[PDB]
Amino acid sequence: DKICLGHHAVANGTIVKTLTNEQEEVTNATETVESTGINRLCMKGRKHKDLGNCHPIGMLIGTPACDLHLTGMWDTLIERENAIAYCYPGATVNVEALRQKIMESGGINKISTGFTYGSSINSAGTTRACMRNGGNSFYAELKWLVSKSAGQNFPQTTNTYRNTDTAEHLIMWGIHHPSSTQEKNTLYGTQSLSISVGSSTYRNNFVPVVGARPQVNGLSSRIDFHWTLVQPGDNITFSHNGGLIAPSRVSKLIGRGLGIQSDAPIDNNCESKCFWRGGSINTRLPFQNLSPRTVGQCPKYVNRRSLMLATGMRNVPE
Amino acid sequence: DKICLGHHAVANGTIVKTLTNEQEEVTNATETVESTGINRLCMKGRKHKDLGNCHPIGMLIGTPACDLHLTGMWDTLIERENAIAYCYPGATVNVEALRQKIMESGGINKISTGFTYGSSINSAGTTRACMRNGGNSFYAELKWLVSKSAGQNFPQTTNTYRNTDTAEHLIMWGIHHPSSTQEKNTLYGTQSLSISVGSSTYRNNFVPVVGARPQVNGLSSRIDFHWTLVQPGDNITFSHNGGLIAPSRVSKLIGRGLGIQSDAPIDNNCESKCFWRGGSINTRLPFQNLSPRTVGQCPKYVNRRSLMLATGMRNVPE
Amino acid sequence: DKICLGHHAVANGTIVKTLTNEQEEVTNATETVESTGINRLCMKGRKHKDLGNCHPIGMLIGTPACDLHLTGMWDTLIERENAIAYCYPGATVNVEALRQKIMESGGINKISTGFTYGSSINSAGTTRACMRNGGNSFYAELKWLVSKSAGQNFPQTTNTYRNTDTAEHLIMWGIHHPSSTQEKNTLYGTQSLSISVGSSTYRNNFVPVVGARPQVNGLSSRIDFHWTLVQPGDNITFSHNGGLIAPSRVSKLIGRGLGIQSDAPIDNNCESKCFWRGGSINTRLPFQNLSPRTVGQCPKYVNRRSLMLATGMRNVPEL
Amino acid sequence: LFGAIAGFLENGWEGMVDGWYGFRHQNAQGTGQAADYKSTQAAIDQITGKLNRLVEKTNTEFESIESEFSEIEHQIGNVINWTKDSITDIWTYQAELLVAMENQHTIDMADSEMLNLYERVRKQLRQNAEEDGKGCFEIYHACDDSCMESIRNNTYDHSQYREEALLNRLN
Amino acid sequence: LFGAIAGFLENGWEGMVDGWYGFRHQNAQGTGQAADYKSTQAAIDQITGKLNRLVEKTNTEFESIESEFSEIEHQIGNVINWTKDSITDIWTYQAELLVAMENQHTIDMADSEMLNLYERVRKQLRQNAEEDGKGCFEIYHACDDSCMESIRNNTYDHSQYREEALLNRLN
Amino acid sequence: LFGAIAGFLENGWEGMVDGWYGFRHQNAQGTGQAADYKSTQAAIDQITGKLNRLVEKTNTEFESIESEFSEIEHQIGNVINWTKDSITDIWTYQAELLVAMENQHTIDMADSEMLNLYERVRKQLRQNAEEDGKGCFEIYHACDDSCMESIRNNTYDHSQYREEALLNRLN
Ligand SMILES: CC(=O)N[C@@H]1[C@@H](O)[C@H](O[C@@H]2O[C@H](CO[C@]3(C(=O)O)C[C@H](O)[C@@H](NC(C)=O)[C@H]([C@H](O)[C@H](O)CO)O3)[C@H](O)[C@H](O)[C@H]2O)[C@@H](CO)O[C@H]1O
Ligand SMILES: CC(=O)N[C@@H]1[C@@H](O)[C@H](O[C@@H]2O[C@H](CO[C@]3(C(=O)O)C[C@H](O)[C@@H](NC(C)=O)[C@H]([C@H](O)[C@H](O)CO)O3)[C@H](O)[C@H](O)[C@H]2O)[C@@H](CO)O[C@H]1O
Ligand SMILES: *[C@@H]1O[C@H](CO)[C@@H](O[C@@H]2O[C@H](CO)[C@@H](O)[C@H](O)[C@H]2NC(C)=O)[C@H](O)[C@H]1NC(C)=O
Ligand SMILES: CC(=O)N[C@H]1[C@H]([C@H](O)[C@H](O)CO)O[C@@](O)(C(=O)O)C[C@@H]1O
Ligand SMILES: *[C@@H]1O[C@H](CO)[C@@H](O)[C@H](O)[C@H]1NC(C)=O
Ligand SMILES: *[C@@H]1O[C@H](CO)[C@@H](O)[C@H](O)[C@H]1NC(C)=O
Ligand SMILES: *[C@@H]1O[C@H](CO)[C@@H](O)[C@H](O)[C@H]1NC(C)=O
Ligand SMILES: *[C@@H]1O[C@H](CO)[C@@H](O)[C@H](O)[C@H]1NC(C)=O
């Protein structure tokens, strides 16, 4: 007569690492590094805006591609790889800071400046670079000012926008840089051009420069965009001689949201809190090896393919 | 006839967390996360300067509010909310870097530049906006140069500051941006204004941006400030024409001190090494959940109200 | 009759810290923090370029000190403490970004711009601030354009460089800021000076600023430098009428290498993967206390002189 | 290490699909096997605890500081790279250490719950039994299947068999 | 885990307030109770050693990188925010690990000191006593308040009672 | 902690050198000392495992973000310092933790292996010997050198000496 104590084992153990052993065999184990994600942006529960081919900058100045995204509310803003900001070729100063400001916003309202120009000014400049409804157009929120009588000096002009609201406004403008002297003269006259902009928290001077440069979308001239924030109650004044690309509406970034840059199609029927270029990560594991670049509430990226957590005893087979 | 072994237990134990068990009752525990700070700036053993309503930038240029803070020595510098840097409208280019330098310093000396101006310059320009002891005044460390005779062209002027000391000097100048061409011509004449600033390692040009139209729009009179370090043995030259707000003294930042932004009252009986917006933190615990923004020697911030460390065995009541 | 159990011990054991004891004696122990580094730059296995007194920036513009460093290939670029970039006084806008780009490259090739200038332009200007063979010279990769006929208005000129390659190219130009109105007038004329620079992606324009400045090398003029990347198939056009220091070659940065800033002497007989100002670090240990600032593949820096890892049992010697 | 599971016990029992720890008995009426429920649940409960802690993490919202689709200024990009990589080295290190230390405790914990069962049965048997080196108790009286159950059931009354047992041990 | 606290010891003693571990005895003269100083100090020392590491403060001085009272440039601000939240997730995670692990070890360490007090007494009594499985030793000869003391005191000479005890264990 | 090293074993044998754990015996023919290879390897192997994990180097390549030889823009210079200092505090604390946690485990694993050898011998000697309390086994029979080796070799059959030893224990 006899009685014996023992523990179970299995035929096929799992290797795990310990403080003392690289190759320790246990009964069961489980992954702690998430390696699979969802190939969709899971936008269920989110007021989301898929921008398509509209670049966030394009929303503020009104590039044709952003016509559907000039105002709105969102808690999540999706930027896409093909995104268009500029129809008429040019660039924006501190562009990435501005892109990030838009991408953390929770919406945008548009507020008319109310600028009016006298009879010497043609405020309806359009271009084949900005098509809209099969026709020559221009940035929706901006106006291309030129001399109404061609080759005449654009008149000394003063325009003032007053923020009568309770939150800050983001105002954008452009500075036309013609591509030749003939064109500068036709549009603004032979006079020396000067544009100065000022508020309580901003002052600058701009001068259109004529320069030969490569054609972009058929065009050798450029439009440089500038922007500043106009605080409540404050006023900003444009004083210009020709070359100002004047704002007809200004912007108001509202609230907060999560900015996402992704390739992945939206699934408005699944939920997630963690996003990346390829879509979403929905997991309970504390680590992941999918992508070092995520946004939202994510597990932490680790440089490991696998990390096994033993969930059983040492496996000693018969 | 018998001897029994056992251990103590208590009426009320404390729940702590373990690797295998949240809600594990033990006989005693002690908190590792400091959640209690004191709402005062403990300055015992610290040579400090509370700047009150004086902004650090104000120290360098001599805003009236900083008259008592133009020089000093300290190991600790305390900045208060809404401190005044400017008496006249305008701002400093690259301001946040400068403010950090000052708040990284252990004191400030001032050195006269020795600048002198010809007879056709009035260097005693003042403004109603910088009142001092009830009179129109100006930044103490600067001079507002205008034409002695109104409307006439401000002469071509050269001024050179030479660092003959063995440490770098921080020189600040201003640029007047006039409210209109009419004001600009009165102060400086009809000529084109140019202000060049050149040392062995710095060169820049400035052109006043002339405002327009009503004084109550966004393009009105302002003085904007600029700064740079002048290395020992090096000279810096101002070539100017009208519009320079010239330095009459330069500064010298000295040693290191600790910069504190807070509106916590100063307590002198009290000693601390860790500070935040709301006061100081005096604790032995390695963690705190008071604030993510602390300066000094601080316990690391964590997003946990409580992390209890067991100081006794499992509590096993009868 | 009895058999006994026991463990070994030693006369001189070493102390380690534990969770419960900062003074715990044990038989063997071993360091986990490297404290000794090599005061040389171990370059065995690395195709390296030692720039000597040539600053990385001067490679692109061709300052005389970098004449043996105008092209090349490397996986390790060594920069030295007072290396020379500018023979003529001035500075580079966005310098540190550019220096970092060069210190990340694995080499540089040079590509002629092919720029030509009309008869009324003197494009061979030189200075005593940039010398070769003990004589007046200039940046090898740039040209100082002035009016051939002194005091005359420098002609309106257009120059276009076209990137026909398949990689991006780094182009650099200079803007000359004269020391006085007299000098300015002599070099470029009395006209107003305007330099504009345009590609598909880049637009900028520059105005020479005349002004009294301290003499650096007996020179109050400055030539300040500017730069931009020109993408494949794109062109960059210089429109200018005085003041342009025009590129005669552009640079192409190739592949990748590690950038080291250090004055330690090279040593080709040892290899390393971790470097700092004071040399190299070679160690199996995960932590080091030599320097908080290292490049390459390094042990993590820690604020501790010593951390002993018990590699034996508790030490309980005889009474 | 508590000296049992990969120690004085030769190996595990692939046949015991009933639980983590158990008994195998031999008496006149043959052999048999039963897994002990309390012990296996003691170990399992501790495992599921580690697992709960593993997935507890409630998390901070992060936003992008790296543009996926546009270029980032070089210097700030290099600072961001250096930071993100430093952070990742730390997490990689913490993940590795978390798993390794956790795996050490998990194994040794399981070794422990097994030694604890063994010891309970050892004290329970008192002087009626002796140990071989290999985890069995040679019982020195006839043990009934009903008696065997009372050893596992933890209701075995040692005084009941002591006289009989003691004679057998000494003769 | 050792087998004792919350193990084969059914429960702790609330009435024992002069030590962590101790003795309750029974002889013809009555009941008694005493704390064991050496074992309870072995435990308290180790606790205090842990606490000492906790408050270890050789610390780095940090300066502000974000202004409480003025605006930071948007992009470097976002970087700083991402960095600071990253650093904080690490410290928050490390704090949780530290006390989870520390606590585990503290519980178990206390358990082992109990076991070692138990093992000490067992080896002392040698053949003069037997275990009841609930932490008590049944002693097979009269044990004086003075004799009990010799056990708590570690001066019990088992051979002095061996003959008597060995025949009481058998008869 | 397990009961033995710095425990019921008063001290260690500086005289032993062919192992970490060993036997000392005394019989008729004199004394003897022999290290146990099996237990000495169990410890050393576990140590080498720790050292291995220590030098397992993950190879993140870092570049410079802090110019050694030129001026760093001041605001970005402060972010970089703050980041680097925050990272160094983390690694320093992690280094302190690693070593303290590892040292704790090493010392107790060492204790463990001793207790396991002691336990293995005890179960081996069965009823032919009695524990000293100080780590020895009083063998209640005559055991010549070959009998000692048999104890160390784990080839000692207790049943051979049992009836003789039992009689000595009982009288
Ligand atoms: C030059 C002058 O006196 N012109 C008269 C104007 O002052 C006046 O308009 C009023 O100007 C007021 C500001 O006046 C000061 C000031 O800021 O306090 C007076 C200072 O002496 C003067 N100092 C200097 C260095 O010039 C100063 C300075 O020129 C300006 O600040 C630059 O803008 O101006 C105040 O703003 C009143 O609101 C304004 O009406 C006009 C109308 O009375 O007549 C001018 O002759
Ligand atoms: C144009 C000229 O020759 N004018 C004479 C001045 O040179 C002379 O002043 C001296 O100038 C010296 C610098 O001369 C160079 C130079 O090496 O830097 C000579 C170069 O050939 C010339 N190159 C070009 C393309 O112009 C160069 C250039 O003009 C300047 O660098 C622009 O600043 O200058 C040196 O600085 C001496 O210290 C200085 O006295 C004056 C007085 O002799 O007379 C001029 O006719
Ligand atoms: C700053 O200016 C002073 C004079 O303007 C320069 O100093 C003179 O330097 C020369 C040679 O170094 C000496 O012979 C003179 O005696 C100095 N003048 C005096 C009165 O000290 C100085 O070199 C300039 N610094 C720079 C960097 O240009
Ligand atoms: C405001 C204005 O001038 N509009 C005209 C422009 C601009 O003159 C140039 O874009 C400037 O160079 O040129 C067009 O050819 C175009 O872009 O389609 C026709 C258009 O009517
Ligand atoms: C393996 O582990 C998973 C999760 O820990 C669990 O669901 C499963 O029951 C385990 N399987 C076995 C063989 O016990
Ligand atoms: C680049 O230059 C070539 C040569 O003139 C020209 O064919 C081409 O149009 C230019 N590219 C652009 C983008 O303008
Ligand atoms: C803005 O303009 C309005 C109307 O002229 C005026 O009341 C207000 O004072 C201006 N704001 C500022 C700050 O000048
Ligand atoms: C312990 O290790 C050190 C260095 O590894 C060595 O010098 C020594 O000889 C070793 N001694 C032992 C085995 O205790």
PDB file of C-alpha atoms in Angstrom, chain B residues 54-119:
ATOM      1  CA  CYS B  54       7.612  92.402 -13.456  1.00  0.00           C
ATOM      2  CA  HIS B  55       8.138  90.130 -16.468  1.00  0.00           C
ATOM      3  CA  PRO B  56      11.639  88.708 -17.002  1.00  0.00           C
ATOM      4  CA  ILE B  57      11.905  90.363 -20.416  1.00  0.00           C
ATOM      5  CA  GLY B  58      11.062  93.651 -18.666  1.00  0.00           C
ATOM      6  CA  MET B  59      14.303  93.354 -16.655  1.00  0.00           C
ATOM      7  CA  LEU B  60      16.481  93.635 -19.745  1.00  0.00           C
ATOM      8  CA  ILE B  61      14.746  96.616 -21.332  1.00  0.00           C
ATOM      9  CA  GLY B  62      13.769  98.608 -18.185  1.00  0.00           C
ATOM     10  CA  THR B  63       9.998  98.653 -18.242  1.00  0.00           C
ATOM     11  CA  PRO B  64       8.826 100.848 -15.330  1.00  0.00           C
ATOM     12  CA  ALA B  65       7.329  97.827 -13.541  1.00  0.00           C
ATOM     13  CA  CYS B  66      10.822  96.286 -13.378  1.00  0.00           C
ATOM     14  CA  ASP B  67      12.676  99.393 -12.095  1.00  0.00           C
ATOM     15  CA  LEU B  68      13.552  97.441  -8.948  1.00  0.00           C
ATOM     16  CA  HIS B  69      14.627  94.413 -11.020  1.00  0.00           C
ATOM     17  CA  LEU B  70      17.186  95.771 -13.487  1.00  0.00           C
ATOM     18  CA  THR B  71      20.121  94.115 -11.686  1.00  0.00           C
ATOM     19  CA  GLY B  72      20.472  91.542  -8.961  1.00  0.00           C
ATOM     20  CA  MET B  73      21.856  88.169  -7.926  1.00  0.00           C
ATOM     21  CA  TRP B  74      19.862  85.073  -7.118  1.00  0.00           C
ATOM     22  CA  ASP B  75      19.929  81.271  -7.174  1.00  0.00           C
ATOM     23  CA  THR B  76      16.176  81.313  -7.680  1.00  0.00           C
ATOM     24  CA  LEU B  77      13.987  83.509  -9.879  1.00  0.00           C
ATOM     25  CA  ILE B  78      10.224  83.623  -9.552  1.00  0.00           C
ATOM     26  CA  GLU B  79       7.922  84.751 -12.329  1.00  0.00           C
ATOM     27  CA  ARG B  80       4.237  85.593 -11.678  1.00  0.00           C
ATOM     28  CA  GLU B  81       1.272  85.366 -14.014  1.00  0.00           C
ATOM     29  CA  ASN B  82       0.435  88.497 -16.092  1.00  0.00           C
ATOM     30  CA  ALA B  83       3.757  90.142 -15.306  1.00  0.00           C
ATOM     31  CA  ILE B  84       4.336  93.256 -17.400  1.00  0.00           C
ATOM     32  CA  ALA B  85       7.129  93.188 -19.964  1.00  0.00           C
ATOM     33  CA  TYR B  86       6.085  96.082 -22.112  1.00  0.00           C
ATOM     34  CA  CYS B  87       4.804  99.498 -21.367  1.00  0.00           C
ATOM     35  CA  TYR B  88       4.498 100.351 -25.102  1.00  0.00           C
ATOM     36  CA  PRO B  89       2.680  98.098 -27.664  1.00  0.00           C
ATOM     37  CA  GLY B  90       4.942  95.561 -29.406  1.00  0.00           C
ATOM     38  CA  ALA B  91       6.633  92.247 -28.698  1.00  0.00           C
ATOM     39  CA  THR B  92       9.951  90.482 -28.691  1.00  0.00           C
ATOM     40  CA  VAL B  93      11.028  88.290 -31.553  1.00  0.00           C
ATOM     41  CA  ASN B  94      12.224  84.885 -30.256  1.00  0.00           C
ATOM     42  CA  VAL B  95      10.863  85.712 -26.813  1.00  0.00           C
ATOM     43  CA  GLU B  96      10.475  82.329 -25.196  1.00  0.00           C
ATOM     44  CA  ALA B  97      14.132  81.451 -25.700  1.00  0.00           C
ATOM     45  CA  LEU B  98      15.179  84.771 -24.102  1.00  0.00           C
ATOM     46  CA  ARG B  99      12.832  84.343 -21.145  1.00  0.00           C
ATOM     47  CA  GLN B 100      14.304  80.854 -20.520  1.00  0.00           C
ATOM     48  CA  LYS B 101      17.861  82.280 -20.575  1.00  0.00           C
ATOM     49  CA  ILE B 102      16.936  84.847 -17.943  1.00  0.00           C
ATOM     50  CA  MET B 103      15.135  82.203 -15.898  1.00  0.00           C
ATOM     51  CA  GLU B 104      18.234  79.994 -16.240  1.00  0.00           C
ATOM     52  CA  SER B 105      20.535  82.796 -14.881  1.00  0.00           C
ATOM     53  CA  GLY B 106      21.850  83.550 -11.377  1.00  0.00           C
ATOM     54  CA  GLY B 107      21.671  87.309 -11.738  1.00  0.00           C
ATOM     55  CA  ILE B 108      21.985  90.298 -14.057  1.00  0.00           C
ATOM     56  CA  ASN B 109      24.433  93.192 -14.344  1.00  0.00           C
ATOM     57  CA  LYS B 110      24.000  96.143 -16.609  1.00  0.00           C
ATOM     58  CA  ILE B 111      26.723  97.828 -18.680  1.00  0.00           C
ATOM     59  CA  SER B 112      26.369 101.195 -20.328  1.00  0.00           C
ATOM     60  CA  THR B 113      26.866 101.103 -24.089  1.00  0.00           C
ATOM     61  CA  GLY B 114      28.295 104.614 -24.037  1.00  0.00           C
ATOM     62  CA  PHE B 115      26.292 105.522 -27.147  1.00  0.00           C
ATOM     63  CA  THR B 116      26.142 109.252 -27.939  1.00  0.00           C
ATOM     64  CA  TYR B 117      24.236 111.021 -30.644  1.00  0.00           C
ATOM     65  CA  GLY B 118      24.836 114.062 -32.801  1.00  0.00           C
ATOM     66  CA  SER B 119      23.030 117.347 -32.391  1.00  0.00           C
TER      67      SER B 119
END
